[PDB]
């Protein structure tokens, strides 16, 4: 048999297992490549979600059908009180 009707599979096998996160604070799995020539700067910043809000702005997208026209768009406000450094954690490359 061939199921008589091919269809896309439900879900995403790559997101499995779909278990609860180990902690409420998701941990970063990767960071941007370290271009040492560039001035030092933080690769990330912690924040707190506050709530989505409506926004409207004229587009600047030449070649778009909506170019030079207002387009409403949602935005996710995120409360981000300034962070303060409290320490450092080094690392050394190992075969493992």
């Amino acid at each position: 048999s061939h199921r008589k009707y091919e269809a896309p599979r439900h879900g995403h096998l790559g997101f499995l297992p779909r278990k609860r996160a180990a902690s409420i604070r998701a941990r970063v799995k990767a960071f941007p490549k370290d271009d040492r020539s560039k001035p030092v700067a933080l690769t990330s910043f912690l924040g707190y979600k506050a709530g989505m809000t409506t926004i409207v702005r004229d587009l600047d997208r030449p070649g778009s059908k909506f170019h030079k026209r207002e387009v409403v768009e949602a935005v996710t406000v995120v409360d981000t009180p300034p962070v303060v450094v409290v320490g450092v954690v080094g690392y050394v490359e190992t075969p493992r």
Binding site: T54, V56, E70, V72
Partner: protein, 100 residues
């Protein structure tokens, strides 16, 4: 940026909010929220509803007519923009709002 007074209660209809029925007569029936739209679907008369601002204007209350309202007209004149005229209008708007 063209806010509309509600067709039912005359309340402002900010962009991204409300609904705009399109009658076959080809004149928009904007509604600030689902309540005004459902009231229009029932053919309720806004003037007969106590909560409608039009009922207040028809009841003889809240200064239904005043000289300050003459500035509220939806002028079709395209008169050219000018920074000095823009600043004078920005001051006159707050002054008329305080007097009103």
């Amino acid at each position: 940026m063209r806010i509309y007074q509600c067709h039912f209660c005359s309340s402002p209809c900010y962009p991204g909010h409300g609904i705009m029925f399109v009658r076959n007569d080809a004149k928009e029936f904007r509604f600030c929220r689902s309540k005004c739209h459902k009231a229009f679907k029932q053919r309720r008369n806004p003037r007969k509803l106590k909560w409608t601002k039009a009922f207040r204007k028809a009841a003889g209350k809240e200064l239904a007519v005043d000289s300050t309202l003459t500035f509220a007209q939806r002028r079709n004149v395209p008169v050219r923009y000018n920074r000095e005229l823009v600043a004078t209008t920005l001051k006159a708007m707050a002054r008329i709002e305080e007097i009103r």
